[PDB]
Amino acid sequence: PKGTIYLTFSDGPVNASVEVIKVLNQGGVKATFYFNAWHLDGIGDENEDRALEALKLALDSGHIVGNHSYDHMIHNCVEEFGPTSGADCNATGNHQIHSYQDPVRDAASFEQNLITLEKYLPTIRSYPNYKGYELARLPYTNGWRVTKHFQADGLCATSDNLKPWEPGYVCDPANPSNSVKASIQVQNILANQGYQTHGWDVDWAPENWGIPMPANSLTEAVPFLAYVDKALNSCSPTTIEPINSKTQEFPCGTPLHADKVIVLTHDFLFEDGKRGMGATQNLPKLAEFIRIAKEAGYVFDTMDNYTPRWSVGKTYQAGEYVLYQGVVYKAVISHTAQQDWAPSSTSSLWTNADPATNWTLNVSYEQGDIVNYKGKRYLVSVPHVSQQDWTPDTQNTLFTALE
């Protein structure tokens, strides 16, 4: 294949989600949906009476569901969060101002999302394609927690005053806004809960969101495919416009990202209504795009496979990454996987390479790494592979406490 495309839809489930799902199904592909459950509560200020129907249809159809937080951080856009807050923030347009504030509260929003999903669909955990507790994406933010060495933030994603399309707006990646700094902490809290987070390469959207009637300004299928072609293997998160969609320190050429393109779009752009004629104009674009992307030799996949699943009978080179039971592992030596050689916290063939900061078993630590353990922070003084008896609090050779 020329490469792998990951279609990711954000900010559902809403009414328009239903027809998007039908189009994917007709096109013979699976996508990943990053949902905000407040639409199930009827308070997300969209046409969303069919929210639960959409949720069920996505899972019944085999699409992957991931976590985009409960309320899309709207609680940071208003003084007091309530049933009208979505409408209030829509009135002001202040979604990317002060978007992140208290990182502990903001991270908790991702757990609340799961509570609400499991309330409206009590059987949701009986679906393997429900990945709401493993896969996440932060509102507004092109940020990544993929492996121990594949992590990077969207350093201009959100603002402390002006919107990115407003005159006089300035971002200094070397000195991120307060909101961005909080978003980085959220990333880290989620990673320690076992989440991976992923951003995107290309966004099927208007030029920017200051743009009026945005649903009417989506790129056509063929030029969008051209844009995808340009993204492939060109470190798109660093070159993408506008500036608040950038991931500045994205690890260019990192092997896990080779021959892949992650597409962001939004369910609500496929609705005929207050944003334009989305369903009439954009659903056929999505249909056509899938078609011509396959002809060009692309295949489509989901974010639960972005990091490839460990597979018996596959030959791995040393340093290759696999995903196993929601945890990332890195091959210690080149070898062919056997049934009883699976990655684990004691495997000789793999080390845990999750993007977390809490001290963890079977991790190859490097000098300078900082770990959290029993409420304290330790510097790795001597590079080593962690094991159960070498805990930071009692191994003075390996770890030095800060500070």
Next chain:
Amino acid sequence: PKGTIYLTFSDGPVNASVEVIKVLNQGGVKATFYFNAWHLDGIGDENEDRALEALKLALDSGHIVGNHSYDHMIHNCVEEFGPTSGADCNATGNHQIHSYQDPVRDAASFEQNLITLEKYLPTIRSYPNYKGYELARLPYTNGWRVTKHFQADGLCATSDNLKPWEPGYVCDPANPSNSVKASIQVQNILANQGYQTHGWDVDWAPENWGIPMPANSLTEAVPFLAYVDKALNSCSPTTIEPINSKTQEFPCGTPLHADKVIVLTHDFLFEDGKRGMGATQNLPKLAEFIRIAKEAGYVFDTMDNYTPRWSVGKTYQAGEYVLYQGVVYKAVISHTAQQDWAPSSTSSLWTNADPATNWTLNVSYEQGDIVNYKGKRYLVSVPHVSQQDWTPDTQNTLFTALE
């Protein structure tokens, strides 16, 4: 050793928890604490201004923290939950009446509990003895979800009308109250989120909870040790009194329970205050009990080890149970454990034996088992070990859909 004692403390963290912890530490034992985070919000109606101090002290001292739900189900004791609800329910004493109503909301209370703990102590996931997301116990309820074949419920734990001690109160284990039925669904929901739950063998309690000043009438250290000796290998959950603390269908002689006694008590019974002189009278009892228990050849352990942890080097017999990363596994073949042979979803040496009902990989299913998959129920038609290709919806020779 004669046997293993598991001291389990319910309903903390409160002020009284602090000196309890000091006594455990002085006695050189570790214990398991089943906490309700509403005390950290200051609304649990106890002396709890030192709640956070207590939480931190328990974790710094190596004790295990388990999940007892956010509010101890007090939301089902009042018409509308708020800051006064603990006090309101303490005024009526209706805790065991309608204690469980909507199992989905009641289970969510356990998740809310973790949000609150991780809010007041943001570094709490850095403690390995934090087991809030793995180990639980239901308020009021001697209920168990340990393995696929070790599961049982407290069939008279809570009522649909009167207090258990009241005249007129009737309990029929063959026709459990609605509150009990709801609590059973709570167990199943928690199990499907990967929780184990455990009840207790003996309860260090007042003579009777029906009458005032319960802290004063706690059994002395020596006679309590005799209660423990008597409970050893005697299936105490079936013989325990009163009827409301019983686990009627507890699996007598089940292998994981051999030579073990789980003790229940409550932190608040060790406080000088509204329940009596608990600190003055009962702390010494606990100090003595630990001393003489050890002297009699008992060891003390924590609930994270109740199901023994898989350990490299140890030799296992076919049929033996281990715990590995919060998941219960059962040995397929007798062997000595090696580094590369951790139990998992692909191991040929172990099968998954978690107490869950959702279809799960690498489970040894038997004819008659019932599983949930993608929102539907299936009956196992022929015995087999589950694997990725053999999903219920595609294997009608192995599974039969239930209408």
